[PDB]
mmCIF file of all heavy atoms in Angstrom:
data_model
loop_
_atom_site.group_PDB
_atom_site.id
_atom_site.type_symbol
_atom_site.label_atom_id
_atom_site.label_comp_id
_atom_site.label_asym_id
_atom_site.label_seq_id
_atom_site.Cartn_x
_atom_site.Cartn_y
_atom_site.Cartn_z
ATOM 1 N N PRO B 88 10.683 -15.898 -1.573
ATOM 2 C CA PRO B 88 11.039 -17.191 -2.174
ATOM 3 C C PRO B 88 10.515 -18.379 -1.375
ATOM 4 O O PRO B 88 10.281 -19.450 -1.942
ATOM 5 C CB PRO B 88 12.570 -17.178 -2.147
ATOM 6 C CG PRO B 88 12.930 -16.215 -1.079
ATOM 7 C CD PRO B 88 11.878 -15.154 -1.138
ATOM 8 N N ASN B 89 10.334 -18.196 -0.071
ATOM 9 C CA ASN B 89 9.885 -19.285 0.787
ATOM 10 C C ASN B 89 8.371 -19.407 0.874
ATOM 11 O O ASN B 89 7.857 -20.207 1.655
ATOM 12 C CB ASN B 89 10.500 -19.159 2.180
ATOM 13 C CG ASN B 89 12.004 -19.330 2.162
ATOM 14 O OD1 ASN B 89 12.533 -20.195 1.460
ATOM 15 N ND2 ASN B 89 12.701 -18.499 2.917
ATOM 16 N N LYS B 90 7.668 -18.617 0.065
ATOM 17 C CA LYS B 90 6.214 -18.709 -0.039
ATOM 18 C C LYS B 90 5.559 -18.584 1.328
ATOM 19 O O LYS B 90 4.573 -19.262 1.624
ATOM 20 C CB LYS B 90 5.805 -20.025 -0.708
ATOM 21 C CG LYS B 90 6.341 -20.175 -2.115
ATOM 22 C CD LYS B 90 5.912 -21.499 -2.736
ATOM 23 C CE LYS B 90 6.357 -21.577 -4.183
ATOM 24 N NZ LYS B 90 5.719 -20.530 -5.033
ATOM 25 N N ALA B 91 6.128 -17.720 2.162
ATOM 26 C CA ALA B 91 5.554 -17.407 3.461
ATOM 27 C C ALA B 91 4.260 -16.620 3.257
ATOM 28 O O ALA B 91 4.120 -15.893 2.270
ATOM 29 C CB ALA B 91 6.546 -16.608 4.294
ATOM 30 N N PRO B 92 3.296 -16.781 4.175
ATOM 31 C CA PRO B 92 2.057 -16.012 4.048
ATOM 32 C C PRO B 92 2.365 -14.523 4.114
ATOM 33 O O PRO B 92 3.020 -14.061 5.048
ATOM 34 C CB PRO B 92 1.246 -16.453 5.269
ATOM 35 C CG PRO B 92 1.765 -17.826 5.578
ATOM 36 C CD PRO B 92 3.234 -17.751 5.283
ATOM 37 N N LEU B 93 1.916 -13.787 3.107
ATOM 38 C CA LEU B 93 2.146 -12.352 3.078
ATOM 39 C C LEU B 93 1.274 -11.672 4.119
ATOM 40 O O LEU B 93 0.076 -11.942 4.216
ATOM 41 C CB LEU B 93 1.844 -11.787 1.689
ATOM 42 C CG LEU B 93 1.888 -10.263 1.564
ATOM 43 C CD1 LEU B 93 3.298 -9.736 1.829
ATOM 44 C CD2 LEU B 93 1.381 -9.815 0.201
ATOM 45 N N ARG B 94 1.901 -10.822 4.922
ATOM 46 C CA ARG B 94 1.182 -9.913 5.795
ATOM 47 C C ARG B 94 1.751 -8.536 5.525
ATOM 48 O O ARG B 94 2.934 -8.391 5.228
ATOM 49 C CB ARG B 94 1.353 -10.303 7.261
ATOM 50 C CG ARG B 94 0.793 -11.682 7.580
ATOM 51 C CD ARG B 94 1.037 -12.047 9.025
ATOM 52 N NE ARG B 94 0.341 -11.141 9.929
ATOM 53 C CZ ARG B 94 0.550 -11.091 11.239
ATOM 54 N NH1 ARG B 94 1.444 -11.892 11.801
ATOM 55 N NH2 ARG B 94 -0.128 -10.235 11.987
ATOM 56 N N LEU B 95 0.899 -7.528 5.593
ATOM 57 C CA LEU B 95 1.311 -6.190 5.239
ATOM 58 C C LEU B 95 0.651 -5.228 6.217
ATOM 59 O O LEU B 95 -0.575 -5.239 6.381
ATOM 60 C CB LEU B 95 0.875 -5.888 3.806
ATOM 61 C CG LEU B 95 1.315 -4.588 3.138
ATOM 62 C CD1 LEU B 95 2.820 -4.520 2.970
ATOM 63 C CD2 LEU B 95 0.634 -4.488 1.787
ATOM 64 N N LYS B 96 1.475 -4.422 6.877
ATOM 65 C CA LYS B 96 0.994 -3.393 7.788
ATOM 66 C C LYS B 96 1.364 -2.044 7.195
ATOM 67 O O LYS B 96 2.496 -1.843 6.750
ATOM 68 C CB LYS B 96 1.636 -3.564 9.163
ATOM 69 C CG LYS B 96 1.015 -2.714 10.269
ATOM 70 C CD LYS B 96 1.458 -3.232 11.629
ATOM 71 C CE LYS B 96 0.909 -2.376 12.766
ATOM 72 N NZ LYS B 96 1.246 -2.956 14.093
ATOM 73 N N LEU B 97 0.405 -1.127 7.170
ATOM 74 C CA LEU B 97 0.634 0.180 6.563
ATOM 75 C C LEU B 97 0.467 1.302 7.570
ATOM 76 O O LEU B 97 -0.361 1.216 8.460
ATOM 77 C CB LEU B 97 -0.343 0.404 5.406
ATOM 78 C CG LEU B 97 -0.320 -0.579 4.237
ATOM 79 C CD1 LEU B 97 -1.374 -0.179 3.210
ATOM 80 C CD2 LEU B 97 1.066 -0.611 3.622
ATOM 81 N N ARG B 98 1.257 2.351 7.406
ATOM 82 C CA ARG B 98 1.101 3.560 8.206
ATOM 83 C C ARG B 98 0.928 4.715 7.242
ATOM 84 O O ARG B 98 1.837 5.026 6.472
ATOM 85 C CB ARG B 98 2.328 3.790 9.085
ATOM 86 C CG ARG B 98 2.240 5.031 9.960
ATOM 87 C CD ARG B 98 3.489 5.163 10.824
ATOM 88 N NE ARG B 98 3.432 6.328 11.706
ATOM 89 C CZ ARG B 98 3.992 7.503 11.429
ATOM 90 N NH1 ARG B 98 4.646 7.674 10.288
ATOM 91 N NH2 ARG B 98 3.894 8.507 12.291
ATOM 92 N N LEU B 99 -0.256 5.309 7.245
ATOM 93 C CA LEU B 99 -0.544 6.439 6.375
ATOM 94 C C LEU B 99 -0.535 7.701 7.209
ATOM 95 O O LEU B 99 -1.186 7.772 8.252
ATOM 96 C CB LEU B 99 -1.918 6.306 5.726
ATOM 97 C CG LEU B 99 -2.248 4.994 5.026
ATOM 98 C CD1 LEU B 99 -3.613 5.073 4.359
ATOM 99 C CD2 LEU B 99 -1.168 4.687 4.010
ATOM 100 N N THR B 100 0.210 8.693 6.758
ATOM 101 C CA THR B 100 0.129 10.000 7.399
ATOM 102 C C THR B 100 -0.031 11.050 6.319
ATOM 103 O O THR B 100 0.611 10.983 5.272
ATOM 104 C CB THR B 100 1.357 10.325 8.270
ATOM 105 O OG1 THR B 100 2.545 10.244 7.477
ATOM 106 C CG2 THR B 100 1.464 9.364 9.455
#
Side-chain angles (χ1 to χ4, degrees):
Chain B
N89 295 319
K90 299 180 175 297
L93 173 64
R94 298 178 63 191
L95 186 64
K96 191 165 178 175
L97 301 180
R98 180 179 181 263
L99 309 184
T100 57

